[PDB]
């Protein structure tokens with residue numbers, strides 16, 4: 619990992635290293651600005667059709683342009699001993715994923731919470747109208763800027779038209795669409811509120827099963843200060859039946875902005 623990709627993007631700190639890539643905080647030497655570069659796990663997973671998933675992820679996010687969605691600025695690959703090293707240059711978000719905020723602060727204030735996810739909705743609704751589906755919406759792919767701004771960031775598994783956060787439909791290879799993301803955000807909205815996903819399981823299958831077989835314990839019954847009006851929103855988006863939940867993410871937001879003010883949720887039960 620040449621601390622100087624293509625001789626232009628000076629690598630610095632390490633913002634994170636998963637099981638596929640290593641994201642570094644870099645310096646664009648030409649534009650004198652800080653950027654976040656994503657590097658395909660130094661060849662350890664660069665020979666297979668994995669490079670495709672990477673190239674097609676850079677371009678699947680490059681197709682979108684919205685504040686809440688991390689922008690892509692450039693792609694490429696630098697040459698190194700073992701071969702090509704595909705990198706992606708994104709906007710830098712000095713922040714924290716929600717996975718973190720829910721780990722060192724516990725649950726978010728209902729209103730704080732409502733606020734975030736409503737912004738996340740705005741990003742997905744856009745992503746949708748542009749024919750992109752983020753098949754991977756989880757607390758670890760939504761970031762909170764150092765100025766409390768929301769950023770949605772992982773498209774590695776997104777297709778243009780760890781299952782604690784997957785939809786029944788997406789559980790199997792079934793129908794995965796707009797509403798799937800809608801169902802996912804419902805889990806996030808749920809964790810940021812209780813401090814946990816609607817369903818916990820010792821093994822993946824027990825969880826999947828729970829998603830498509832058990833009603834999500836109402837938020838109120840799971841945590842303190844929870845407006846049974848907020849329950850109406852959470853449990854709606856978590857409805858096992860696509861048709862019975864919000865059809866668009868803007869429709870979900872609409873019912874979040876409602877609760878945020880003081881209005882009645884146009885959600886049932």
Ligand SMILES: Nc1ncnc2c1ncn2[C@@H]1O[C@H](COP(=O)(O)OP(=O)(O)OP(O)(O)=S)[C@@H](O)[C@H]1O
Nearest residue numbers: 633634636637638639641654708709710711715772
């Ligand atoms: N633009 C960015 N700015 C700051 N940190 C970022 C940025 N993009 C990613 N990160 C950090 O890098 C971590 C890994 O991001 P991902 O893109 O989801 O990683 P990944 O290699 O796809 O790992 P997986 O497959 O999602 S488990 C994040 O959870 C952040 O801490």
Ligand SMILES: [Mg+2]
Nearest residue numbers: 636758759772
């Ligand atoms: Mg991640």
Ligand SMILES: [Mg+2]
Nearest residue numbers: 772773774775
């Ligand atoms: Mg990914």
